[PDB]
Design an enzyme around this catalytic site. Sequence first.
Site, PDB file in Angstrom:
ATOM      1  CB  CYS A 114      -1.047  -0.023   1.125  1.00  0.00           C
ATOM      2  SG  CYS A 114      -2.453   1.104   0.871  1.00  0.00           S
ATOM      3  CG  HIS A 207      -4.095  -3.323   2.436  1.00  0.00           C
ATOM      4  ND1 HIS A 207      -2.937  -3.325   3.182  1.00  0.00           N
ATOM      5  CD2 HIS A 207      -4.467  -2.025   2.323  1.00  0.00           C
ATOM      6  CE1 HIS A 207      -2.620  -2.084   3.506  1.00  0.00           C
ATOM      7  NE2 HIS A 207      -3.530  -1.276   2.993  1.00  0.00           N
ATOM      8  CD  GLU A 209      -1.497  -6.528   3.811  1.00  0.00           C
ATOM      9  OE1 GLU A 209      -1.523  -6.821   2.596  1.00  0.00           O
ATOM     10  OE2 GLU A 209      -1.661  -5.363   4.232  1.00  0.00           O
TER      11      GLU A 209
HETATM   12  N1  LIG Z   1      -6.290   1.973   4.593  1.00  0.00           N
HETATM   13  C1  LIG Z   1      -5.754   1.634   5.900  1.00  0.00           C
HETATM   14  C2  LIG Z   1      -4.353   2.224   6.055  1.00  0.00           C
HETATM   15  C3  LIG Z   1      -3.330   1.321   5.376  1.00  0.00           C
HETATM   16  O1  LIG Z   1      -3.613   1.261   3.971  1.00  0.00           O
HETATM   17  C4  LIG Z   1      -6.669   2.136   6.979  1.00  0.00           C
HETATM   18  O2  LIG Z   1      -7.744   2.680   6.650  1.00  0.00           O
HETATM   19  O3  LIG Z   1      -6.330   1.976   8.171  1.00  0.00           O
END
Ligand SMILES: N[C@@H](CCO)C(=O)O
Lengths: 268, 268
Positions: A114, A207, A209
């Site tokens: 990410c 993501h 993972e």
């Molecule tokens: N999108 C994630 C942060 C890491 O991509 C969040 O909303 O916590």
Amino acid sequence: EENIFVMTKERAETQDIRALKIAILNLMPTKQETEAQLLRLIGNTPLQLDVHLLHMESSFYKTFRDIENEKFDGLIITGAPVETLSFEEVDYWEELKRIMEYSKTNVTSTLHICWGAQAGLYHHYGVQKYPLKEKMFGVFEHEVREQHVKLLQGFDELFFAVHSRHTEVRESDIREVKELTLLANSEEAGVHLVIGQEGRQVFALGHSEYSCDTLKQEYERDRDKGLNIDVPKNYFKHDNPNEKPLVRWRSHGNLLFSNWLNYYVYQE
Amino acid sequence: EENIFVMTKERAETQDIRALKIAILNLMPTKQETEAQLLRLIGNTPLQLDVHLLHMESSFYKTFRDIENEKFDGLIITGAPVETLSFEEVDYWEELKRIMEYSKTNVTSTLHICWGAQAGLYHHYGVQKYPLKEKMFGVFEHEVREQHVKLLQGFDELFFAVHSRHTEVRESDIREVKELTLLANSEEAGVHLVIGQEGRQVFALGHSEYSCDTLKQEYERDRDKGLNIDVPKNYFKHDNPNEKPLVRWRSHGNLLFSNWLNYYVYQE
Ligand SMILES: N[C@@H](CCO)C(=O)O
Ligand SMILES: N[C@@H](CCO)C(=O)O
């Protein structure tokens, strides 16, 4: 015939292979959850792994100064809660640059997730990131864009992966860079898998993972803060946040990490 | 801290594990293609495999009389081009019954594919098969029906698998048998994965072992015979038989065979 031959699929002998040195640079807010997710996914290999935990210099966790004179087979740079900021505004940007420069010469293969992937794309290749009008948030269909690339071995041609981000990198910006190859994109979500310098860098903007309830927890976290957040897409049955999350992405989460470890981190 | 611990994912030591004895009972018309498909899928294990090829008694191929006094860890009974016939009308039915009876006591785990699965369900459990008005033909979405079953380890909750058959077994008929458990069904295609006696039998009514072009070749084969056959479903883009087949099912083909070998054929 007196002697009928049998066909033998030979024993995969990996016991005399050296243990691989992996470092995890944990930048995530959910430090425990992120670490746990990554350790389980890294388990997808018959090889032995020595896993070193790192975090920013700003008792299992080390810093860059502890490892700067060492080499690693693999490094994972996680996502981070800093995407709306210009890269140079991030408090630890100079230190991360040092780590990313180090990775070029001292790490066989670095996997970036990410924002970590956005940071790597920006630092190494000048690829900019751009704000989105609303969060790209849910589980999305992706298509394999390259045949015969080891990172994608065993992948279905169409597969699912979660995305969770208020920013993006753009395909056209990836395309113009010679040293980058787009491996998997999504009609809805955009860029997911990208390889740099034949595997020296692996970028995963989605993501893969994420475990079962991660998008659920993010949705509820944002909702409770008073943020205007839509239900994650293709995740709750009938878009009902009370229903069990549907998990369409775990198999390719496993394949991504398994292929990365077996074909890029490990070198014969 | 002077001594910072690393986390070690231990080496998976499988080198001292005995080679597994697998037999393949090949009943398919495309003998070469079916064997090749199965050998590649059986490759999905670090363990060593001794693969014995069998065929009906009606120079690598043996018959049942050669192995009747031996034990095996695994047996695969393939599909066959005989589905419209009552089981007892099939020419080699009595011999197959002998093999299926033998499998109960002499084979740790038997995997049955398509008609082989219908034959096994009928012989062991009295489950009848029924004609369809048109071929169930294409790649179909399936849902996992049991949690925590080793055959389904690493499966997505929703996954794709090919079906190719003019007959079916019915879910209600599987449900009433205590010794059977439905593992995966499809809203459109019906029954796919079923386990018998905790893994002593594994039934796969769909064709997870099919390679890229198998449905294409079946479609063209039937079309050329003058048969009335529709395009395989969810297989050609825009239902255009000239387009490359979309492969949504390979990852779970691999997982099925890998989990079968690792968790059912092998016993500690
Ligand atoms: N999108 C994630 C942060 C890491 O991509 C969040 O909303 O916590
Ligand atoms: N459906 C296959 C037979 C094995 O299921 C065919 O049409 O050849």
